[PDB]
């Protein structure tokens, strides 16, 4: 807002708004993701180490 960024970053916010909306949506994808969350066959902790540690 130094008159060298007048109306330019202001409109430029909306692309940044896109990133915020894009981020939140994909984070929710990480929600539908959860079927093997710690229940894999390679990283899968058998039982214990939970301790409020939802690895990813």
């Amino acid at each position: 807002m130094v008159l060298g960024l007048d109306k330019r970053a202001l409109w430029g916010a909306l692309p940044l708004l896109g990133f915020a909306i894009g981020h939140f949506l994909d984070k929710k994808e990480t929600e539908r993701m959860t079927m093997f969350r710690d229940k894999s066959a390679l990283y899968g902790r058998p039982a214990g180490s939970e301790g409020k540690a939802p690895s990813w």
Binding site: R8, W11, G12, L14, P15, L16, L17, G18, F19, I21, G22, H23, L25, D26, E29, M33
Partner: protein, 446 residues
């Protein structure tokens, strides 16, 4: 990846708002910077959004697409000078950008093909809405119909694959393998036209010659690469059938390579030289790819990326002459070392990269591809030698005759080099030197 997608959609409005050519430009570079930051992938599909993923193979291709798509706006400013519907230009570019991202991230074959062939339109706008030569009409006919005449038929192969497979995610096809001898040609040849192949090179010189700086940069910078990216994903299950019938394709590519290089020597148009040159390099890429060996494939990925970059920069050079001396001919353009000596530096460098002079991600390619082909068949060496030899040969001629001889008598006063073009040339080349430090991301994807 939806982060990128939503960013581009929220950039679309700027096309309507007046005087946003430069604001759009900075944003496209800025998001490219953001997409740079997002990098942790392995061979497995990653960043699995609703239907969008990303991978070694797709990650670099997307970065180049975002990279080149931002560099358009640096390249083309005569649109602003003329006020030639800058709004439609900016909208066309962004639409193209979104399609490329969705093409390269479509984890389904059908989604991939859908965006792949959806890109037929916005490119056609870019040539036709801002072309110069009257040939622009027939050129658009060549481009569109060479593509659709084979790009449509793979639609059957895709659905046939569905019926026999049950889906079209890439990992799922890899589990199976098909040998019905038409599936192979229908998919292969359909990609080969856009590759393109020497026997179907025909359209490509025309499309480049009568297209603006922007369209030509797009055409040689992605479209050819996009065809190749599909190949890398699809040949996973075409192996047996490919092995039976592969000598034909490698032969015509290698044979066509020396020929098209000799066409370059005899050619007399800056865009024609580069256009034929780009076909030559994509000939070798098609060869190493169809070798299917590890060395071939991992090198093909690299050479596509490097070739796209060098081809773009050379097109900016061709634009520079076309925008000063107003004529594409070799004859008119000459002795520019006397008029833009600091520019002729960049002429040399971009030429250097195209003849595989290090440190150059292009060069890194040919080591990989040439190793693959030589292993595949010792007979190749007798033509590989000449192919590279004439590759460098015409590039030498292009650099020298354009920049060296005594000036042309009839030449009307034209402005000198300028920051936009200077920065444009650095931006295409300097990353082409950067990447060698960390080729592993651009070198390993299998």
């Amino acid at each position: 990846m939806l982060k990128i997608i939503f960013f581009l959609l929220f950039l679309i409005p700027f096309c309507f708002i007046n005087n946003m050519y430069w604001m759009v430009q900075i944003m496209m570079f800025f998001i490219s910077f953001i997409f740079l930051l997002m990098n942790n992938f392995m061979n497995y599909w990653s960043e699995i959004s609703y239907f969008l993923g990303c991978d070694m193979l797709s990650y670099g291709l997307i970065l180049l697409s975002l990279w080149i798509c931002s560099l358009m706006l640096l390249a083309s400013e005569m649109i602003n000078k003329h006020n030639n519907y800058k709004n439609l230009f900016l909208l066309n570019i962004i639409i193209l950008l979104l399609l490329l991202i969705l093409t390269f991230s479509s984890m389904s074959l059908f989604m991939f093909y859908l965006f792949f062939e959806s890109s037929l339109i916005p490119t056609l706008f870019l040539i036709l809405g801002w072309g110069y030569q009257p040939e622009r009409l027939q050129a658009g006919l060549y481009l569109l119909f060479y593509t659709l005449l084979v790009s449509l038929p793979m639609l059957i192969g895709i659905f046939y694959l569905m019926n026999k497979i049950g889906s079209m995610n890439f990992y799922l096809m890899n589990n199976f393998m098909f040998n019905y001898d038409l599936l192979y040609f229908c998919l292969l040849c359909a990609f080969l036209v856009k590759m393109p192949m020497f026997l179907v090179h025909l359209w490509l010189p025309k499309a480049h010659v009568e297209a603006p700086v922007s369209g030509s940069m797009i055409l040689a910078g992605i479209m050819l690469k996009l065809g190749g990216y599909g190949m890398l994903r699809v040949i996973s299950f075409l192996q047996l059938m490919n092995l039976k019938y592969s000598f034909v394709w490698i032969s015509i590519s290698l044979v066509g390579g020396v020929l098209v290089s000799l066409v370059c020597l005899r050619q007399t148009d800056l865009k024609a030289l580069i256009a034929y040159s780009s076909v030559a390099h994509m000939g070798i890429v098609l060869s190493g790819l169809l070798t299917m060996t590890y060395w071939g494939l991992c090198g093909s990925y690299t050479l596509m990326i490097a070739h796209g970059l060098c081809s773009s920069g050379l097109f900016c050079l061709a634009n520079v002459s076309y925008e000063r001396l107003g004529s594409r001919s070799m004859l008119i353009n000459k002795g520019l070392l006397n008029f833009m000596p600091s520019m002729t530096l960049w002429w040399f460098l971009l030429s250097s990269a195209n003849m595989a002079a290090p440190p150059t991600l292009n060069l890194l390619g040919e080591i990989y591809l040439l190793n693959s082909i030589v292993s595949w068949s010792w007979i190749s060496m007798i033509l590989l030698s000449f192919l590279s030899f004439f590759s460098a040969a015409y590039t030498l001629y292009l650099y020298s005759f354009s920049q060296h001889g005594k000036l042309f008598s009839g030449v009307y006063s034209f402005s000198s080099g300028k920051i936009r073009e200077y920065l444009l040339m650095l931006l295409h080349w300097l990353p082409l030197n950067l990447l060698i430090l960390k080729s592993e991301s651009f070198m390993l994807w299998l």
